[PDB]
Design a protein around this ligand. Structure first.
Ligand SMILES: Nc1ncnc2c1ncn2[C@@H]1O[C@H](COP(=O)(O)OP(=O)(O)O)[C@@H](O)[C@H]1O
Ligand SMILES: Nc1ncnc2c1ncn2[C@@H]1O[C@H](COP(=O)(O)OP(=O)(O)O)[C@@H](O)[C@H]1O
Ligand SMILES: Nc1ncnc2c1ncn2[C@@H]1O[C@H](COP(=O)(O)OP(=O)(O)O)[C@@H](O)[C@H]1O
Lengths: 723, 470
């Protein structure tokens, strides 16, 4: 159907002049690497970008950022028409003027600040109408190509003259402010966006599709997550992406208003919002008004709830509007909205993770000049329980740090913000360092559903177990067919046991990264914490946040944590079935058999475990992880000292025969000891930092064998029968 | 609608209903349905307010006004019997009650046929498979399931390709197809199943999976079938039937599989309260559910109440106590006042017959006791042929041979070695690829990790009991 009209997708290339296409696509349309192209879209308008190759792009697509998007008046989805245009001879004159609503405050040489660094022999082919955006000076400035000598479209060469009448321009209507929200401003939400995106692709993009069809237009959407995870941000982005109206509502906003009127407020709300439908009625902080749970001590309090409860079942009005509600948690709200007609769909917004955070920052530092020493990565590498919000002001304070020093003291700033100054401003890593050490009131550090950042490159022990483990996880995940070819069922999970120092978790971690799945870790202490409070109810709350994010591996460090507690060996007249321990069996029994969740658990005490866990159907698979063999001890250090200043004379094979009863832990012990002695050398002299032999050796001095010989046998006594 | 009458200004709520039952009686015979009764029915202490109560009264009265000669029927649906308020249990108002259990095996499957009866489904569409994996789904859950499923086959075909414009085309739709792979998405898409609380389904297993101790099979029927299919002859003699039986012996011998299997041989419901849920009541000293359970066993007849690890409570505690336990005893209560002349059989199995409160065996409750020992050399064979039925068992596969190999094993252990033959058979498959016929070398290479769940010492313990217990 004509290899020209393509669908506009995301933009792997963030350039105000490009439309990345697939390699096998270009060949179809005879386009070179630097073949300038002619874009033709809706609202009788065009543009002139550049085509490129993208291996990670289906031929049925044409990537382009919002800039290339807006100028084409084509949202994500609509049809465009690329076109080779190798006749756009270089231009002569260019008249570009900033927008009044994108320069308030700055003043000076705009031709040197934004335009100069932009057309830096980039040969960016502009055109009459386009609205390129340039970032600098800690802000965004949108320009408008009013008129160019070689109209309409003329390439810009290091010769092309540029004019700047130094006079703003009132923003048009058809032209949305690129300062608005969108996907190009969301970090850490691969699994996330997918969810919402396709859920509104039809009820919000093709309101006509449901005009004739008996399908149910999913109307209700809920967003969980800890405040700060930028819930609202998403909602807005979705609308500004499809072009649907957006009506915002604040939690207490509707509670402040005089009673009774609250019903009219909403009354007019969903009313005035349905006029511009298709629309997206979003409500910040739902639990503020929908806690029909228990805290319903007043009529007004209740009456408000009803008003919504009804307007929701009124979304079957043929207007195709989507109601989005975000909140703290599923318990705050009231099941009254779980009616399969109202807020039937749900989506969790987990906190930012490894790749997420890092990416996030790139979204708030994309305007401030960062020195080379700025190690943006390091950031997301130390913020353990941070949210999109936390990391936000992080930059805020960070920049303000590099600020209070430069122009502040050098007082060029009592009057206004010169353009030149800003663009020159720098913000080294040491600045942010302050920010971190400054405000650590991070949002949550309560729980975590992240993915392991460790492969098998840190294990280096008992390789045999590595694969065998994969025999219960890798095969069922990517080989269910052959698997079901016999009718048998996989194993819900394994139960690692052995002597401390092994590295049990290092497995649960690795195997998880192997399947790039989530790694939930409930260490023994948190278990006991449930025990001393007899509130294992969380148990049901936990095996759930594992299914709300599948694949995923549930881990219970020191399962025996509750064992040695109540007595352990002889303990009391009781038997293995402990309050928490047992409750866990429940949420493991009704745990979806045909789901995507592996349950692992390790214990340095296999002698005090309730046999109900090993009973076929739960943890029917048991594996023993023995101490470090003549081999392990070797690779273990070679690895446990990978990102470290190990000298050349350092000979590990030697030590590979020295410590025999030790474990991956003990080995690490002596390691750090070599450093707490190596750094000690450094400082002194100062008032040449490379690990050496005399250190490692002077370290074995305080050698300790965590695993006694008596115990070495105990686990074996068990090993024999337990396996 | 529940909140529909609560939203309206106070006082008017009484008029809303006032006109409700009013305008509804005009067109009588009618059927005044009310969704979410409990939304206004907790005349309970959950009324820390004034109007909250006034509304309740309005109905409470209009109900006793249904004796108006108009013949109208008031239907109220709700979450549970505890949410409401006994004030409506007046034998004149909502005197009749009916539970709406969640969809089951045959149910779900059939349900889908009701929402996919308009969309062309490709041959590869295995509608059955669906209802075969949705464990705790309701007619509603399965609903949007199709919704999303079709929309999947939609966003692809006419979406990327087609026309809609002034309006859609007739042809197009009829040609549209929705393969199984589409639904596969739906399942993996939204799994927030409404509930997975409790189950009152019917067993999907006959005696074709038991294949052991046939004797017990019929005798069991002597307390359940004969006394229900022949109450005329049983009463002929006079004596009164036996309430329930108690299975006991070494684990891994499908005792549960019997009580459950028979539940099909009598096509009745099979309620299963496994030991853990018992303990859960114990650690929380809230055996009150006990009364809530023997009731849902009654609000669903026929039915077979089955308690696994019956000793699970005692197993935990013995100590300075005696036999009777908080939960255990409470169970005797709801079993004593359990309708003698009703239609409910109470079965319970325990791998620990030595630690049971004798009050359960006392004639009148579980006066019948049965021992189901380990797998005889006979049963052992079929046991395999029954646990390997839907299996790529090769021809050279010779079970009679193994029928003499594993002697101290049980239906469970036998199954153990089985799956092991596969977790080695599939290994051959995935490995070489980068030949699906289970062979001997597998089964044999499997006995390598053979385990006898039942030690010889214990083998005798249950017997020591078996004799005196019989
Ligand atoms: N994932 C993210 N990507 C980019 N910015 C984010 C992200 N998460 C949070 N932010 C920043 O933090 C703010 C959080 O906004 P908000 O939607 O109100 O969060 P919430 O409603 O969950 O409290 C955003 O305005 C944005 O500037
Ligand atoms: N096999 C191993 N190879 C290298 N280091 C190990 C190994 N096992 C343990 N360690 C080290 O021992 C310490 C204990 O690690 P860990 O595996 O997390 O504990 P656990 O034995 O409880 O699973 C860590 O610092 C880790 O780096
Ligand atoms: N006689 C038998 N024939 C076939 N399979 C059996 C037999 N007895 C037990 N099994 C198998 O052994 C396992 C024992 O299961 P289970 O029902 O939990 O034991 P029980 O009912 O004795 O508590 C099941 O997988 C079951 O299919």
């Amino acid at each position: 159907n004509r290899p020209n009209r393509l669908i506009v997708d995301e933009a792997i290339n963030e350039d105000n002049s490009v439309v990345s296409l697939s390699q096998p696509k270009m060949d179809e349309l005879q386009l070179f690497r630097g073949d300038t192209v002619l874009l033709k879209g809706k609202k009788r308008r065009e543009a002139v970008c550049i085509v490129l190759s993208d291996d990670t792009c289906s031929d049925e697509k044409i990537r382009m950022n919002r800039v290339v998007r807006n100028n084409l008046r084509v949202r994500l989805g609509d049809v465009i028409s690329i076109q080779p245009c190798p006749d756009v001879k270089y231009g002569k004159r260019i008249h570009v003027l900033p927008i009044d609503d994108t320069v308030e405050g700055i003043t000076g040489n705009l031709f040197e600040v934004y335009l100069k660094p932009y057309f830096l022999e980039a040969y960016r082919p502009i055109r009459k109408g386009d609205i390129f955006l340039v970032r600098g000076g800690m802000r965004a400035v949108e320009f408008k190509v009013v008129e160019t000598d070689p109209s309409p479209y003329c390439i810009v060469a290091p010769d092309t003259v540029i004019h700047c009448e130094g006079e703003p321009i009132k923003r048009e209507d058809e032209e949305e402010s690129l300062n608005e929200v969108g996907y190009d401003d969301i970090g850490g939400c691969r699994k996330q966006l997918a969810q919402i995106k396709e859920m509104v692709e039809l009820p919000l993009r093709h309101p006509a599709l449901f005009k004739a069809i008996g399908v149910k237009p999913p109307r209700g959407i809920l967003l969980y997550g800890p405040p700060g995870t930028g819930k609202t941000l998403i909602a807005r982005a979705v609308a500004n992406e499809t072009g649907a109206f957006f009506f915002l509502i604040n939690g207490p906003e509707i509670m402040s208003k005089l009673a009774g009127e609250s019903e009219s407020n909403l009354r007019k709300a969903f009313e005035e919002a349905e006029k511009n439908a298709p629309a997206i009625i979003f409500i910040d902080e739902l639990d503020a008004i929908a806690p029909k749970r228990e805290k319903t001590h007043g009529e007004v309090e209740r009456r408000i709830v009803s008003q919504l409860l009804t307007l929701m079942d009124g979304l079957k009005q043929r207007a195709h509007v989507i109601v989005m509600a975000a909140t703290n948690r599923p318990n705050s709200i009231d099941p009254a909205l779980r009616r399969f007609g109202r807020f039937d769909r749900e989506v969790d917004i987990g906190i930012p993770d490894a790749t997420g955070r890092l990416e996030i920052l790139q979204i708030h530092t994309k305007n401030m000049k960062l020195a080379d020493d700025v190690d943006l990565e390091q950031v997301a590498n130390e913020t353990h329980g941070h949210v999109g919000a936390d990391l936000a002001a992080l930059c805020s304070e960070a920049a303000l740090q590099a600020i209070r020093k430069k122009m502040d003291l050098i007082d060029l700033e009592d009057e206004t913000i010169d353009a030149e100054v800003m663009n020159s401003l720098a913000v080294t890593m040491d600045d942010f360092r302050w920010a971190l050490s400054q405000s650590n009131p991070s949002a949550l550090r309560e729980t975590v559903v992240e993915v392991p950042q460790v492969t098998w490159e840190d294990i280096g022990g008992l390789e045999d177990v590595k694969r065998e483990l994969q025999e219960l996880v890798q095969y069922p995940v990517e080989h269910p067919d052959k698997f079901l070819k016999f009718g048998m069922t996989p194993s819900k999970g394994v139960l690692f046991y052995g002597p401390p120092g092994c590295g049990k978790t290092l497995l649960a971690k690795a195997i998880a990264n192997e399947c790039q799945a989530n790694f939930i870790s409930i260490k023994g202490p948190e278990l006991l914490t449930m025990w001393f409070g007899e509130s294992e109810a969380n148990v049901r709350e936990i095996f759930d946040k594992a299914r709300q994010a599948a694949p995923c591996v549930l881990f219970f460090d020191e399962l025996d944590s509750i064992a040695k507690a109540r007595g352990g060996n002889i303990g009391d007249g009781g038997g293995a079935a402990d309050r928490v321990i047992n409750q866990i069996l429940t949420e493991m029994d009704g745990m979806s058999t045909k789901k995507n969740v592996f349950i692992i658990g390790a214990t340095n005490r296999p002698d005090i475990i309730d046999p109900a866990i090993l009973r076929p159907g739960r943890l029917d698979q048991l594996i023993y992880i023995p101490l470090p063999d003549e081999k392990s001890r070797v690779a273990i250090l070679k690895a446990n000292l990978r990102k470290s200043p190990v000298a050349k004379d350092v000979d590990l094979e030697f030590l590979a025969k020295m410590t025999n009863g030790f474990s991956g832990a003990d080995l690490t012990e002596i390691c750090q000891r070599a450093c707490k002695l190596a750094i000690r050398e450094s400082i002194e002299s100062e008032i040449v930092p490379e690990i050496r032999r005399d250190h490692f050796e002077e370290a074995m001095r305080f050698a300790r064998r965590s695993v006694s010989d008596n115990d070495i046998r105990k686990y074996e006594m068990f090993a024999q029968t337990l396996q």
